[PDB]
Amino acid sequence: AMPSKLSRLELLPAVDVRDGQAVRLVHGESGTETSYGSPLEAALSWQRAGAEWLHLVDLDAAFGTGDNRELVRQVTEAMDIKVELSGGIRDDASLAAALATGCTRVNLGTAALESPEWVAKVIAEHGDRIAVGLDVRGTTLKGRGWTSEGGDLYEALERLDKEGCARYVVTDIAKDGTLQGPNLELLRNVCAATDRPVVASGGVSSLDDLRAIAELVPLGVEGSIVGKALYAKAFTLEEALEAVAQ
Ligand SMILES: NC(=O)c1ncn([C@@H]2O[C@H](COP(=O)(O)O)[C@@H](O)[C@H]2O)c1N
Numbered sequence: 001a002m003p004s005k006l007s008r009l010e011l012l013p014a015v016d017v018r019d020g021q022a023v024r025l026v027h028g029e030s031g032t033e034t035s036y037g038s039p040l041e042a043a044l045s046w047q048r049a050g051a052e053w054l055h056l057v058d059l060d061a062a063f064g065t066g067d068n069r070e071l072v073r074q075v076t077e078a079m080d081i082k083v084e085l086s087g088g089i090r091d092d093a094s095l096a097a098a099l100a101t102g103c104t105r106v107n108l109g110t111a112a113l114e115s116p117e118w119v120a121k122v123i124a125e126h127g128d129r130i131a132v133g134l135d136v137r138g139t140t141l142k143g144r145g146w147t148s149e150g151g152d153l154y155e156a157l158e159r160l161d162k163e164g165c166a167r168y169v170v171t172d173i174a175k176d177g178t179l180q181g182p183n184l185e186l187l188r189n190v191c192a193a194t195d196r197p198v199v200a201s202g203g204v205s206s207l208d209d210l211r212a213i214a215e216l217v218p219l220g221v222e223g224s225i226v227g228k229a230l231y232a233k234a235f236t237l238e239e240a241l242e243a244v245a246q
Pocket of ligand 1: 016025027028029030057059061062063086087088089090107108109110111133135143144145146171
């Protein structure tokens with residue numbers, strides 16, 4: 001593989017919080033949670049292993065089953081590394097609270113489906129501290145913890161591009177928590193549709209899968225979120241970082 005000056009693929013280990021625990025689901029389905037203990041210990045583990053980013057989700061807030069605001073605040077404050085924070089960020093107050101944690105950026109999901117004028121305003125005011133999470137089954141967007149129906153993926157990308165959105169985080173729900181491998185086709189198709197950076201999520205199962213996503217960096221894929229493969233020890237984060245470096 002020929003040398004290049006392009007950046008390497010960024011890795012964002014996930015810490016998804018439900019009922020006070022770091023959890024992994026299958027297709028994000030409520031009730032399929034596997035718990036891996038405290039979110040703080042999980043986050044600090046990834047930081048010790050050399051993580052540059054943490055992808056931190058309050059899943060109770062996404063589902064609407066209470067929240068974990070104090071814990072995700074504490075985790076964010078403990079990180080020296082960059083933190084991408086999401087879950088429940090759907091109006092001015094929840095956005096203000098999220099930003100006050102000192103996270104590096106937030107992801108908006110449901111609000112891009114239910115409150116597009118508000119998302120447009122937030123993008124215009126906050127720039128690259130905002131990314132939109134586009135979570136699909138096929139090309140159909142889903143909200144509210146993936147329990148609600150949104151529209152077509154590409155319609156949304158076209159609108160959000162025009163509104164000046166900086167970055168998209170794209171999950172294939174059918175791959176998430178499955179260790180089936182990532183949907184590379186989805187990533188290539190999204191990169192064909194937008195010139196903004198794209199962060200992949202869902203299905204990574206192996207170092208070879210990360211290498212495959214890394215090949216798409218020159219198409220526009222900036223990073224990869226990894227959950228179950230790290231928690232289930234398919235590989236270490238040290239190994240994953242070396243795999244995408246070189
Ligand atoms: N069911 C799930 O696993 C799930 N549901 C939502 N999410 C994440 O929650 C966040 C969106 O929350 P909201 O829709 O409240 O903005 C995004 O990061 C999105 O990927 C999940 N990981």
